[PDB]
Design a protein around this ligand. Structure first.
Ligand SMILES: *[C@@H]1O[C@H](CO[C@@H]2O[C@@H](C)[C@@H](O)[C@@H](O)[C@@H]2O)[C@@H](O[C@@H]2O[C@H](CO)[C@@H](O)[C@H](O)[C@H]2NC(C)=O)[C@H](O)[C@H]1NC(C)=O
Ligand SMILES: CCCCN[C@@H](Cc1c[nH]c2ccccc12)C(=O)NCCCC1CCCCCC1
Ligand SMILES: *[C@@H]1O[C@H](CO)[C@@H](O[C@@H]2O[C@H](CO)[C@@H](O)[C@H](O)[C@H]2NC(C)=O)[C@H](O)[C@H]1NC(C)=O
Ligand SMILES: *[C@@H]1O[C@H](CO[C@@H]2O[C@@H](C)[C@@H](O)[C@@H](O)[C@@H]2O)[C@@H](O)[C@H](O)[C@H]1NC(C)=O
Ligand SMILES: *[C@@H]1O[C@H](CO)[C@@H](O)[C@H](O)[C@H]1NC(C)=O
Ligand SMILES: *[C@@H]1O[C@H](CO)[C@@H](O)[C@H](O)[C@H]1NC(C)=O
Ligand SMILES: *[C@@H]1O[C@H](CO)[C@@H](O)[C@H](O)[C@H]1NC(C)=O
Length: 526
């Protein structure tokens, strides 16, 4: 229960899971805390320690703004940090099976949160279930988000950008140098992550400095080519400058601006973070990944287009109702507390809220493609169209387009379509299979019979956990034993994908074909 790592000894605790035992090491540091002179700069390597580090409770989450749009509502506070915020937050967790394995496949979790929110300590990211049931090692890390994590004055190492991504990269390095001690195979490592986490995994596939730190990759409702995932260098400047005047730190020696930003208090930096976007949307990414010339050598859509990425297998997928969650954070006429029937005019105003800097014609073109009903009199028509608009634009079509382009360079790719709504889901029914609500199935939570998941859900989670582990171990997401529908590879020709649900696992072709031609060919032009 003590492990000797490159930098010192760490003590963990033993857990009782499913009449078995999993060893957890919660909150191992992987970098010098980025305080003081180090705020905004790349993570610096951790140097030796004395004693036995006591890795028995989750560490501090990184500084971030909390979602207080629904106080006391579990559906949204389940995503708020469940641990003290602090700039001193660069820590990671390890869950190894007991008895200690010998050469276990490592699964590495990167959480989402629009690059502004997130912590590895959330209940639905607990890795003990996967360690128990599939005997993989599970690793998750905290990385700097928002301005502390992605503030950029490009080239200037005082705030170069992509620091949070470099946090992640530094944890991957740590698994490379230390996981064998824990019983893990450094040579068999799968990144997986969700939303902004998944966009992070995709960018690790492009970033040469990560190519040797993992082998395979899983992307859950996310990819770098999503319209929210990369901040432009034009915008990155506009936004750190807007933070400078907002804290009365405007200068002209650009370095003296950063030094001034280093004497502000985290919450005063947290505070003015919100208003840097001229017109915000529920999908706004105030401070995000930039083309920094260090982590990202070029605009990523071009690296993808030109085959410049790690050649390996990918598992990619999205949920049926990605877009609904965001409607109740700004869309007029919407609420988690009713069925949110809106009218044609409320829909049009909702586009103004989701596509603010977009021409009158572009918004008219969105309405035209999504409002040609079978059925004019259906009252939910506009309500469902605006959910689909946001979901297809922000998640589904980019995940599909990433998967085509990646597979066109010869690697195996597997696409799923999660369409089960969780029986415990706290948001209303009209919101459907929401953004984020497959994580708990991936992580094995329905396997706890003691927490009110239907039996169908238990089996579904059990099959998903198997398929995910078989992808991690063997590059092939099959469940080979219980006579399950085979999961075909995704090719740019066929475009076969696998649906995931409790009734029927079907193989279908060309998800959202007509919707995605609009988004990824026509719409980028207006
Ligand atoms: C569904 O609810 C929305 C919004 O919820 C209401 O907002 C509060 C102000 C209060 O009235 C609560 O009971 C609700 O939760 C309704 O949107 C409101 O609708 C009318 C006009 O459409 C008006 O009171 C407000 O302008 C709207 N809300 C705004 C501007 O935020 C909507 O009407 C409800 N629809 C159905 C079918 O129940
Ligand atoms: C000026 C406002 C900034 C909005 N910054 C987003 C962060 C974010 C979380 N995720 C994302 C995915 C893509 C792009 C951005 C984000 C924010 O806070 N949006 C509010 C809605 C958050 C939802 C609702 C709860 C459950 C569903 C998932 C998260
Ligand atoms: C870039 O950010 C600048 C601030 O540096 C924004 O300028 C403001 O824009 C809004 C309206 O769009 C107003 O508050 C003011 O008219 C602008 N302020 C100043 C000082 O000019 C600007 O909007 C952003 N650039 C865009 C949107 O193209
Ligand atoms: C680190 O942990 C040591 C071992 O803790 C022992 O076991 C745990 C489960 C508790 O029951 C604790 O009270 C036991 O002593 C401690 O002895 C030691 O003081 C700790 N040191 C630091 C610096 O945290
Ligand atoms: C673990 O497996 C790798 C190949 O994936 C092998 O090279 C390595 O020597 C093994 N290490 C063990 C069994 O300790
Ligand atoms: C101020 O800018 C100059 C170049 O414009 C640079 O040499 C100097 O380092 C900056 N100030 C500080 C304190 O570094
Ligand atoms: C296969 O089926 C059995 C029940 O017959 C079930 O208990 C087991 O968990 C299933 N395995 C997987 C990997 O789904």
């Amino acid at each position: 229960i003590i492990i000797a790592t490159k930098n010192g000894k760490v003590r963990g605790m033993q857990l009782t899971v499913f009449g078995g035992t999993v060893t957890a090491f919660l909150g191992i540091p992987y970098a010098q805390p980025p305080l003081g002179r180090l705020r905004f700069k790349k993570p610096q390597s951790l140097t030796k320690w004395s004693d036995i580090w006591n890795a028995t409770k989750y560490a501090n989450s990184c500084c971030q703004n909390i979602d207080q749009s629904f106080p006391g509502f579990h559906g949204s506070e389940m995503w708020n940090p469940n641990t003290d915020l602090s700039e001193d937050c660069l820590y990671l967790n390890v869950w190894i099976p007991a008895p200690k394995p010998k050469n276990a496949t490592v699964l590495i979790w990167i959480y989402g949160g629009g690059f502004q929110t997130g912590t590895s300590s959330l209940h639905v990211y607990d890795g003990k279930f996967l360690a128990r049931v599939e005997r993989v090692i599970v690793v998750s890390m905290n990385y700097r988000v928002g301005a502390l994590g992605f503030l950029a004055l490009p080239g200037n190492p005082e705030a170069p950008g992509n620091m949070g991504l470099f946090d992640q990269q530094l944890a991957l390095q740590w698994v490379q140098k230390n996981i064998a001690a824990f019983g893990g195979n450094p040579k068999s490592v799968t990144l997986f992550g969700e939303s902004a986490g998944a966009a992070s995994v995709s960018l690790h596939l492009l970033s040469p400095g990560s190519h040797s730190l993992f082998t395979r990759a899983i992307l859950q409702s996310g990819s770098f080519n999503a319209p929210w995932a990369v901040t432009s260098l034009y915008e990155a400047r506009n936004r750190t400058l807007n933070l400078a005047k907002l804290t009365g730190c405007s200068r002209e020696n650009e370095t003296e601006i950063i030094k001034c930003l280093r004497n502000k208090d985290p919450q005063e930096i947290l505070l003015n973070e919100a208003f840097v976007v001229p017109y915000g949307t529920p999908l706004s990414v105030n401070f995000g990944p930039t083309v920094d010339g260090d982590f990202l050598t070029d605009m990523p859509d071009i690296l993808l287009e030109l085959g410049q990425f790690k050649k390996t297998q990918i598992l990619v997928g999205v949920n049926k109702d990605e877009g609904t969650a965001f409607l109740v954070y700004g869309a007029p006429g919407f609420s988690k507390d009713n069925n949110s029937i809106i009218t044609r005019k409320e829909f049009q105003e909702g586009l103004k809220i989701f596509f603010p800097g977009v021409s009158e014609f572009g918004k008219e073109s969105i309405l035209f493609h999504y409002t040609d009903w079978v059925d004019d009199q259906r009252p939910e028509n506009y309500r469902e169209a605006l959910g689909d608009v946001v979901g297809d634009y922000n998640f589904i079509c980019p995940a599909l387009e990433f998967t085509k382009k990646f597979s066109e360079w010869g690697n195996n790719a597997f696409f799923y379509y999660f369409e089960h709504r969780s029986s415990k889901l706290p948001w209303p029914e009209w919101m459907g299979v929401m953004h984020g609500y497959e994580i708990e199935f991936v992580f094995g939570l329905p396997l706890e019979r003691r927490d009110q998941y239907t039996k169908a859900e238990e089996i579904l989670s059990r099959s998903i956990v198997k398929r995910w582990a078989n992808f991690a171990k063997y590059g092939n997401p099959q469940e080979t034993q219980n006579q399950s529908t085979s999961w075909p590879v995704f090719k740019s020709t066929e475009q076969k994908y696998l649906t995931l649900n409790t009734e029927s696992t079907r193989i279908m072709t060309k998800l959202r074909a007509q919707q995605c031609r609009f988004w990824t060919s026509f719409f980028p032009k207006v």
